[PDB]
Design a protein around this ligand. Structure first.
Ligand SMILES: N[C@@H](Cc1ccccc1)C(=O)O
Ligand SMILES: N[C@@H](Cc1ccccc1)C(=O)O
Ligand SMILES: N[C@@H](Cc1ccccc1)C(=O)O
Ligand SMILES: N[C@@H](Cc1ccccc1)C(=O)O
Lengths: 504, 413, 508, 498
């Protein structure tokens, strides 16, 4: 009845029998590359596998994808318990990176550091000289500008502008390693959004059959469509997730969202570009707008960073990941925790626990009450059935909303209204089953059975397939009642048929 | 905005904060912030309550600090319009290494010292049950009966028996770091949200402590994860935010106070006051106490006739406290001649307490107008409202009233 | 959003664009028995034909019923524009009547105000009544009345108060004076009269209704729940599908309304003779209470008597009658019954036309959204698919501003449960059962249509044909057009257990 | 819905919140009868200036005030009684029957004449009326209605000074009966010479309200306001809507008028009889939205002129007027010339008290809140809002001009509004507004302001406990100013009943 009293009833000693509705995306790297480890990671709750193309070769990532798909299809023998695992391609984009250390160096406060463009010191960086790959650096920043190196752990101040160099004073010190990312906040970064390397990697994704692309450093709508053109006709089905990681992306969010399939909120990279006391507002703004438009939103960076070396996360991390879920994030991404961490499996397992516990603190009723009031007054048959199905899901105490779909668009439209009941998406399309994980609350199942001659025989077969899996995952028992969404005729165009069927 | 989602959607990071910072700021005063000149700058920056950790330091050491807090505070007493009341808190040591005594021999000595030093509130450490709260109440006695007891939840048993503690206490402190080692980390946020929620329902203050801005001890800027951690705590419905080592021994104490003001004022824009009040009105037991009736009616009017503030003429503070439990968007200007209640009012979120130093007029009605006019001048100076605006004034009916039942819709002169 | 706003922007110069959703029942007597008149009455609005079995023999009514069906089936050649006409049998019921005054049945004796009068059960006085002595055919008068009770003679014009009780005699005091004729109705306010639910004639009349294949029975003078089941048992297994509408005619019927409603299919509020029993300042509350309780239950309620009585002699009704009928519609009544206006009056056609005008004007004053909003919260929590799909269809009817709700029903039940929640859009009940199409008129909002097409062997095609049939009628009646969107409720597979399927379909 | 919870056996547990206006004629003129009428529930006494001399009405007013001030000994039980003046206006009236009523039969021929020799010789064949310009404004086929529309005539032949009509709807024709000409450009002045003399007499008699007959446009109300002028600036003008143009140009009339009377009987003749119920609901609704009193008149308990008990159709009609949101309901011939005048007022009190049980006050308030676009208004909303929240027994309002209490009644609370006033005229005028229980304070003004309020609140608290509005332990809401000689009624205090 009230959100306030809903928070008052939260018991920590009471185990949560609420399904972990958010999708877990894991960055696959050197520590989780093997087939055997991936098998366990899928069981723990991995839904999407991210491949970071900032490092490694095409051949390296090709073997990674093979290991991901081998571990996934090891459960294909049992379609009742099978889980679709999506493949993701994270682009490098316009990055500025440091060189190599001669022979990690320790930087002291107030010390003079010379950032050069001379390729003689490319692989000879020390406590005095530094090299980076952005040739137009002295043309974009003036005297007094702040240069951030390695997650913004090392901060510099330009004392004097040079020709092919920059004289900087160290404000924040630390262990400066090789090949580290460089940030220039408030600079006219004139690097292309889609570099020549990005064009190579994006086309490789088309050939490796990726389900989604995480496009880095997206600043405007024209950037998104440049990624759309590179994917072309053969990659028209691949979902483009635009990563917001600077101030311009926050400023021009409306045009980015309207051009993109989804948005990734990189809170670490954003925290360096914009002031720290404003990042929480940007996260809550961007997630809320993605909820309004009904497009997937992923939270990345600074999630469980402590789990790279320790088998347990801290308090602040557990609270921060949970608050992202409460904001309305569809997915939450693990970076170095699963990529190169000492405890990759535990990083996935803890994420399942943190997200599942956050589910109890979500007041679903209000979300649907509010989303239907902003839902445009339309006569769209699918949209009217989507509202009606979620409306009926709350009133019938429904175990699930079974949605029969080919494209996924009808199942995605149900997810927009955020129901308590999990949305079982029945499909024969393997890609749309993988891509369904981007959305919160959608439980995708892949029907392997052939298309039945009669239309009614096919629907009842797919409904009974979803009924079996829903009972297997404990969503609903025998005496429960669920909602089924289908079309009316073969080649319908609209998923407008809603029926309230009791579970056999 | 008609919608909480719409309220989140319209948020703009480039837009300067329009709403004043309703959250309370509590600072641990130690070696770094002990000096009068530093304390003066913290009061200007936004410090409301001064904390003294009795885990270390002698009674001589703390009495010198309390004197310095009051030396810094009373320098602003020259301007009654701009003067800010600063509360003095006493954080008791608490038994450390369970049926260990609720109040140790040192704690009893420290508590009685607080009564002598005229402290405003006690942060009772390691509270596990209701008998622990009553034992602290016993030590304070009749001389410290107006001192507020804020129970510190630090263990698993503190969470399990929270309801008997809250009813007995005057307020609650969520020690998040201390709770983090006692219970699993993936559960602390739920415990934090439950406690803050139940405190909001009860009408009793709630404070968030430990692991707020720990990085500001050595660095002049916080990590963005801390900025989120502080903001969400405020967004849960917390009244006050407590800084520990950032102000006590850290290298950047003044910067920590200013950063606390910036985060909490930014988190203020993400708060939906329409939902908070409507839910608190529904869940509240329907009257029939004339004050609770007038408190609800005033908060509803603050939205309906779009008021700039709620002026409350209170003596003990309880009236402004019962208006604060319903969470209005407009600030609650609590006018009082009592210094202690002006100091203790910072515990409640949304209250701007002002100390009236004017003499009591022989005619009651004239004294009310004088107290109201003072609140108008303060409100205009703080930029809460202007001449054209309308405010809601709350008073008692006659000299020596048991109720604050009188309500006035009054245009600003 | 405001109900007051609706009243503020009402215009009398503006004709009603809102459709008349409340069913019209007409009594067929001497003035309207002719097929030609019955043809014109169906055109004007008539939905249900009422036969008053209080007068006229079985032979007389059988011709009228035949005449009603002759006039109805003349429009059968066009399935799109055909309107089913229901047959209603109004029973005579139990009635207390006096004897004859001093011989002849035309003789009339004056009665003093404040004088003593005696009532006897001795049958020797049955044709020997005067100023002092009166006779009643009710043999059990003494055991239902007590000292100080009221006895009303002839439509409540003569009131009496009993002073002393006996074994089979009553001495009474006269309060209301006037002339007293022979064999006239007697009323007992607040008294639990134990006359049998069905009279010996009613047993004959109810069996006759089954033989004439009636749709509904207006069971007269219902006082308790067992009275309804008495009529039910008489109609038997053969007349199980005949709807029983209980008539509330006295104080006991109002007091024991809940048990009557839970035992009946519908309710009739006969305000006229109910006004004789209970005081005038309480009749309107009884009317508003009973109609409200019927809406919550989801069972039809009809208002009767004192409707357009002036139209028996005049071509136009009075203001008070126009407002009285409109208020009854606004209370939430499903049907509105005409008595002497259509039966024995001078202007039976002008009466049916006027009823269409008032009931259509009242529809504008009704705020449809609120009716559903208050009925949604009061609906007890149930996981029954048939009721759960019904709430979703009415939810969408306001959401996507639908032209109509198309319901494929066989027994009527599916359409009834949708009508319970009162949507603005009409409920087109597509049925193959002729009786279902006729009985549906009892519910407000239901526009029944009779599909005469053969059952298509492919189930999906049989639905599409019935849906396209409703789509054809909907355009013809002007409920919706090409651009509009409608809601369709169906089963799932041939011989479905529930009507669980709902569709949002555009109009071709 | 609380409609299902209604019970006819249980006595009404709520006060009769609507006002009762009774017409005073020969059958209720006496002081003895008037006393019992005030006891039975009469609030406003209407004087119909269509009949009787100025000498006749002055004695009637005297008798009303003599009967009212007999209860003045007990200020707790005292009820203020208002005096109303109903103007004649543009009326058309028949002549006098020679030799008594004549029988008019359907199909017969009746001649309408303007001959002054025939003005007192009216019969079955010939009939005289006072409208001298009837020939110029009426046409062949036009309908002429006589005696409140009971008798109808259709014009068959026109003449220079005569009209030949056919009797369409027959009946019994009395003397000096009212004549209607629907759809005719009646060039009779809105304010006649008699109307000027009657209004000036009203000011002389110190009347509280004027019932303005046959108002078609806004300038008709302004013309009445001019005749009252400076001396009668505080007399409330209630415009009667009796014709079609009054409905068409309603928004301009309401703006110029203090209140509205819905003459349903006259309206049912001038417009189609079926569309009247919509007009009644529209005019009441617009009056409730504007915060001005609306009265329902004519065809209330008409059968009570002859019978001691009304029909159920009359009871259901009178109740529905209240249920539409009417402030007052007026009796005409039932109390003026009827055989049972006292019983008519008692039925009125019963019906309106029973109809009160079927009103959902929370619905009305939540709807009137949103349509509202000032400290006095803001405090008026808050008082009604709180009255539901703390189940208040009453809303006590200290008022001088009455406006403060009128602002409260506008939002239609469930709790009775007790208006404490020292102004006698505002105490009498307060009956126009629904849910306002006016009470006249005759106590001297206390030197200390807070003392004057606490004494007045105690006076209202004694009245409320006597009327059964509340008791010890209940909660009331008090509305006052802040100081003596103040602007706004912005003070709201919640006070428990001792
Ligand atoms: N789609 C995710 C999360 C999820 C689980 C269960 C129900 C709904 C969503 C998965 O299948 O793992
Ligand atoms: N109570 C705190 C915060 C606050 C400011 C302004 C209004 C309300 C609350 C203070 O006065 O400093
Ligand atoms: N069922 C009635 C009334 C009605 C009309 C239109 C829509 C709904 C109901 C008829 O067919 O005439
Ligand atoms: N105004 C009328 C009716 C009324 C009675 C009681 C309460 C409110 C109104 C009177 O005082 O007599």
């Amino acid at each position: 009845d009230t959100f306030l009293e809903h928070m008052c009833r939260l018991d920590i000693d009471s185990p949560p029998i609420t399904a972990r509705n958010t999708g877990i995306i894991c960055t696959i790297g050197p520590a989780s590359r093997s087939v055997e480890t991936l098998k366990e990671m899928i069981k723990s709750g991995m839904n999407v596998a991210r491949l970071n193309f900032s490092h490694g070769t095409h051949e390296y990532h090709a073997e990674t994808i093979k290991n991901v798909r081998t571990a996934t299809e090891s459960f294909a023998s049992d379609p009742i318990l099978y889980r679709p695992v999506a493949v993701a391609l994270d682009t490098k984009g316009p990055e500025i990176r440091t060189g190599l250390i001669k022979g990690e160096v320790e930087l002291k406060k107030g010390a003079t550091l010379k950032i050069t463009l001379d390729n003689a010191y490319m692989e000879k960086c020390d406590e005095n000289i530094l090299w980076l790959d952005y040739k137009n650096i002295c043309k974009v920043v003036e005297v007094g500008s702040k240069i951030y190196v390695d997650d913004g752990l090392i901060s510099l101040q330009v004392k004097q502008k040079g020709a092919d160099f920059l004289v900087t004073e160290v404000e924040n010190g630390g262990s400066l390693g090789s090949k580290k990312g460089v940030n220039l906040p408030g600079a006219a970064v004139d690097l292309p959004a889609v570099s020549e390397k990005d064009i190579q990697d994006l086309k490789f994704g088309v050939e490796q059959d990726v389900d989604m692309v995480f496009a880095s450093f997206i600043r405007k709508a024209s950037d998104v469509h440049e990624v759309r053109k590179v994917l072309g006709e053969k990659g028209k089905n691949i979902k483009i997730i635009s990563k917001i990681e600077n101030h311009e992306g926050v400023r021009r969010f409306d045009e980015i969202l309207e051009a993109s399939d989804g948005i990734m909120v990189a809170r670490g990279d954003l925290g360096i570009e914009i002031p720290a006391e404003k990042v929480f507002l940007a996260q809550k703004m961007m997630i809320g707008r993605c909820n309004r438009a009904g497009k997937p939103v992923i939270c990345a960076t600074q999630m469980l960073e402590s789990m790279i070396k320790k088998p347990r996360p801290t308090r602040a991390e557990g609270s921060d990941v949970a608050n992202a879920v409460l904001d309305g994030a569809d997915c939450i991404m693990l970076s170095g925790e699963t990529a190169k961490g000492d405890y990759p499996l535990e990083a996935v397992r803890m994420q399942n626990l943190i997200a599942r516990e956050a589910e109890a603190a979500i007041y679903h009723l209000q979300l649907f009450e509010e989303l239907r009031r902003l839902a445009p007054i339309t006569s769209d048959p699918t949209e009217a059935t989507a509202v009606g199905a979620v409306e009926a899901s709350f009133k019938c105490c429904s175990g699930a909303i079974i949605v029969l779909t080919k494209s996924g668009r009808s199942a995605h439209q149900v997810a927009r209204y955020r129901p308590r009941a999990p949305i079982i998406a029945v499909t024969r399309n393997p890609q749309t089953a993988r891509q369904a994980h981007l959305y919160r609350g959608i439980f995708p199942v892949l029907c392997k059975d052939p298309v039945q001659e009669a239309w009614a025989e096919d629907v009842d077969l797919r409904v009974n397939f979803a009924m079996n899996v829903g009972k297997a995952r404990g969503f609903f028992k025998k005496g429960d009642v669920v909602i089924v969404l289908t079309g009316w005729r073969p080649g319908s165009g609209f998923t407008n048929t809603m029926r309230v069927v009791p579970v056999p």
